[PDB]
Amino acid sequence: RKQVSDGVAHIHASFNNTIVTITDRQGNALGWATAGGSGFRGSRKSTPFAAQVAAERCADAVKEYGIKNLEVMVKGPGPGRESTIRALNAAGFRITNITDVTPIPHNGCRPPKKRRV
Amino acid sequence: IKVRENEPFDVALRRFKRSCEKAGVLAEVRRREFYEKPTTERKRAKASAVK
Amino acid sequence: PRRRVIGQRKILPDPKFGSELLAKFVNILMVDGKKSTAESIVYSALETLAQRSGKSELEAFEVALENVRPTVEVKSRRVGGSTYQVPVEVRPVRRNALAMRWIVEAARKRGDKSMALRLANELSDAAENKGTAVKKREDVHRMAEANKAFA
RNA sequence: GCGGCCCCCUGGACGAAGACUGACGCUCAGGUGCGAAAGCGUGGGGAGCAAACAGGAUUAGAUACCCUGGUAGUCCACGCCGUAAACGAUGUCGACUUGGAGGUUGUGCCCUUGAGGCGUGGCUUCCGGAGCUAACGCGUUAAGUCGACCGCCUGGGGAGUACGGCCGCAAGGUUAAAACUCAAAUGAAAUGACGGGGGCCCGCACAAGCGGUGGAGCAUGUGGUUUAAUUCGAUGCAACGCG
Numbered sequence: 001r002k003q004v005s006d007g008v009a010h011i012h013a014s015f016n017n018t019i020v021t022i023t024d025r026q027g028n029a030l031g032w033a034t035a036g037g038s039g040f041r042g043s044r045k046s047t048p049f050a051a052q053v054a055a056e057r058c059a060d061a062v063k064e065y066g067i068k069n070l071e072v073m074v075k076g077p078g079p080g081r082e083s084t085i086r087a088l089n090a091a092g093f094r095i096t097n098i099t100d101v102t103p104i105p106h107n108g109c110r111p112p113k114k115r116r117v
Numbered sequence: 118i119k120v121r122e123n124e125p126f127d128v129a130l131r132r133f134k135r136s137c138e139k140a141g142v143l144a145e146v147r148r149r150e151f152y153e154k155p156t157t158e159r160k161r162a163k164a165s166a167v168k
Numbered sequence: 169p170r171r172r173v174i175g176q177r178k179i180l181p182d183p184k185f186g187s188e189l190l191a192k193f194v195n196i197l198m199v200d201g202k203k204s205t206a207e208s209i210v211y212s213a214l215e216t217l218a219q220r221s222g223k224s225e226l227e228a229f230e231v232a233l234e235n236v237r238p239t240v241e242v243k244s245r246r247v248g249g250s251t252y253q254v255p256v257e258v259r260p261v262r263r264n265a266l267a268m269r270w271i272v273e274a275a276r277k278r279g280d281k282s283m284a285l286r287l288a289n290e291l292s293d294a295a296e297n298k299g300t301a302v303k304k305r306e307d308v309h310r311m312a313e314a315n316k317a318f319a
Numbered sequence: 320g321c322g323g324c325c326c327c328c329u330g331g332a333c334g335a336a337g338a339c340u341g342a343c344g345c346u347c348a349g350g351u352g353c354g355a356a357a358g359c360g361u362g363g364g365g366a367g368c369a370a371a372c373a374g375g376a377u378u379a380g381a382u383a384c385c386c387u388g389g390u391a392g393u394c395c396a397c398g399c400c401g402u403a404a405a406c407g408a409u410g411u412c413g414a415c416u417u418g419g420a421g422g423u424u425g426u427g428c429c430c431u432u433g434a435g436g437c438g439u440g441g442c443u444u445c446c447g448g449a450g451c452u453a454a455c456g457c458g459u460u461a462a463g464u465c466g467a468c469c470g471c472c473u474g475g476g477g478a479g480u481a482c483g484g485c486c487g488c489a490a491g492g493u494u495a496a497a498a499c500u501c502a503a504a505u506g507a508a509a510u511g512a513c514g515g516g517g518g519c520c521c522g523c524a525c526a527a528g529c530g531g532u533g534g535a536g537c538a539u540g541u542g543g544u545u546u547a548a549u550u551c552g553a554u555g556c557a558a559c560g561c562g
Binding site (some may be wrong): 002048077080081082083086097098100102107113 | 118119121
C-alpha cells in the first residue's frame with residue numbers, strides 16, 4: 001500500500017552489536033531488525049555475518065513497499081559498514097551517496113572514566 | 118576512527134592504527150590535565166640514551 | 169624446508185606410452201617399490217577403461233583428468249584464532265599432484281578382493297564424473313566459496 | 320595557574336630615540352598578603368559523574384578491579400581550613416669567560432620587492448669546548464671563575480613520634496626531644512646467566528606424506544612382585560635387547 005520507491009536508510013554500528021533500519025524521506029520508518037535476531041549470540045555479533053544476514057532479512061521484509069533507491073545514514077565507528085552497503089546494493093536497491101553523521105560532541109560531559117581498560 | 122572499506126579483510130589489519138594510537142596522549146587526556154608530560158615524544162627518549 | 173630449492177625432478181616412465189603424465193600416475197601408483205605387478209594392474213586398468221568407454225583410450229584418460237580437476241583451495245595458518253586464510257591459487261604442478269593423489273585415494277577407499285577389478289571399475293565410473301573422487305572434488309569446492317570472506 | 324565569543328573596570332613586560340631627579344640601592348630573623356583537590360558551616364542548584372552501599376560472574380583466595388544501579392561530593396554566594404613529588408628535586412641580586420642549527424618579538428636604513436643584509440634587544444629550544452663534577456652529567460638562562468646576604472646539615476631506626484606553648488569549629492598544622500638498638504643505612508657507575516619487556520638470523524621442530532603402537536598375541540628391567548633368593552648398578556631428551 002502506497003508504494004514510495006524512494007527513501008533513506010539509517011545504519012547503526014557499535015562495538016557490541018549492530019542494527020539496520022529503513023525509513024522514507026520525511027522519516028516514518030518501515031523496517032526494523034536486530035542482527036542478534038538472526039542469531040549468532042555472543043561476540044560473533046560483531047562479525048559481518050550477522051550484519052549481512054539481518055540486511056537481506058530486512059530487505060525481504062521491506063520489498064512490500066517497492067523501493068528502488070536509498071541513502072546511507074551510517075552511525076557509529078563500530079566494525080562493519082561494509083556488509084550492509086554491499087548487501088543492499090545488490091538486494092534490489094541502488095545506492096545514491098554516502099554520509100558521516102556519527103556525532104562528534106564538542107567536549108560536553110565527562111566520559112565514563114571508571115573503566116581501567 | 119572511521120571505516121569505509123570493502124568485504125575481503127573483515128578482521129584485524131588495523132594494527133597500523135594501533136601504532137598510530139599513541140597511547141600516551143589518549144591515556145593523558147582521558148584522565149585529567151598534566152601540562153608537563155606529553156613531552157615524552159622528545160627530551161627523554163633521544164636525550165636519555167645513557168650507557 | 170626453508171633454504172632448499174626445487175629442481176623439477178622426474179623419474180622412470182612407462183616406455184609404451186612415454187608420457188610424463190602417465191609416468192607420474194604409474195610412479196605414484198607404486199607401493200613399497202613394486203614394479204611388475206603395479207604396472208600390470210595399471211595396464212589392466214587402462215585397457216579395461218578403454219573397453220568400457222569405447223572411445224580412444226588416451227582422450228578418455230584426458231577427459232577423466234579434466235573431470236577430476238579441482239580449481240582452488242586454501243592453507244591453514246592459525247593467525248587470529250579463527251579461520252583467517254588467504255585463498256592462494258595452488259601451483260599447477262601441485263594441483264596436478266593433488267588431483268593424482270585424490271584419484272589414487274579414491275581408488276584406495278575400497279578393500280576389494282581383486283585390485284585389478286576394483287581399480288578398473290572405479291576409474292571407469294569416475295571417468296564420466298560419476299564415480300568416487302568427484303565427490304571429493306565437490307567437497308573441496310564446498311570448502312571454497314566461503315574462505316574469501318577473510319583475506 | 321591560566322583556553323568558546325561580546326562589552327566595562329583594571330595589572331605587569333618590552334621597543335624607538337628624546338628631555339628630566341641625582342645614590343633616592345641590595346638583601347631580609349619576628350609580621351602582614353596570596354596560595355590547585357580533597358574537608359567543615361550557612362543557604363541556593365543538581366544534566367551527566369562517581370568514595371560509601373546495593374546484585375551477579377570471580378578462584379587456592381576476594382569486603383580486588385568486570386559489569387548494572389546508586390547518596391555526599393564536583394556547580395553557585397559568602398566564611399574557615401595553610402598543607403603536595405608547591406621538582407628546573409638548582410633561594411635572591413650583580414660583574415666577566417670558546418661555539419653551533421631554531422621558535423618567537425620591534426624598530427635601522429636599505430635591497431619586504433624573494434622570506435636578503437642591522438639582533439642593534441627581550442623571553443625561550445636542543446647539541447656540544449676550555450673548566451668543574453665521585454660519576455651521570457652541568458656547560459653565557461653555569462653545578463665556572465668572584466662579590467652582598469639569608470635559610471638550612473652533622474649515621475640509620477626510635478620519629479616529623481610524645482609532653483609543652485601557639486593557630487583553629489573539627490579532622491588537624493607549624494616549633495621540636497630523649498631512653499634503647501644496629502654494624503651499618505646510601506649514591507653513582509654494564510661488570511653477568513635476566514631478555515618471562517622489546518628487535519634479528521638458525522634446526523624434519525614447524526607449512527606435506529609413510530609407518531608405529533598408548534588398539535589385540537609373545538621377551539625386556541628397574542619402582543617391582545606371588546617363592547629360597549629373585550646380585551652392583553641404567554631415577555629428565557643419561558630408565559630397555561644397557562652394562
